[PDB]
Amino acid sequence: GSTAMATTMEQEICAHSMTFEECPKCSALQYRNGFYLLKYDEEWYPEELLTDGEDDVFDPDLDMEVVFETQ
Ligand SMILES: [Zn+2]
């Protein structure tokens, strides 16, 4: 194709919407779509994305305190 990585034709061809170059951004490797944070269909999607679950956790359970089952 063109002189681009992974023979990108610059016509946005991938499993997902973007180009091969933009595949990691498209979360092509993951096959889990990055956009739409609140995914009702997917389980604990915002939590998975969040580095720290302290804000998004109920009061009786503290992620910091318990090493196991940390979100
Ligand atoms: Zn892609």
Swiss-Prot record:
PTM info: Phosphorylated.
Function: Forms a complex with host RAN and probably binds to exportins carrying activated MAPK in order to mediate the hyperphosphorylation of host Phe/Gly containing nuclear pore proteins (Nups) resulting in cessation of active nucleocytoplasmic transport. Proteins with NLS signals fail to import, cellular mRNAs fail to export, and some proteins small enough for diffusion are not retained anymore (efflux). The resulting inhibition of cellular protein synthesis serves to ensure maximal viral gene expression and to evade host immune response.
Annotated positions of the Phosphothreonine modification: 51
Subunit text: Interacts with host RAN; the complex L-RAN recruits cellular kinases responsible for the L-induced nucleocytoplasmic trafficking inhibition. The complex L-RAN can further bind to the host exportins XPO1/CRM1 and CSE1L/CAS. Interacts with the protein 2A.
Record organism: Mengo encephalomyocarditis virus
Segments for region (Acidic): 41-65
Residues annotated with Phosphotyrosine modification: 45
Binding site for RNA: 26, 50-54
ZnF region ranges: unnamed: 14-26
Record protein name field: Leader protein
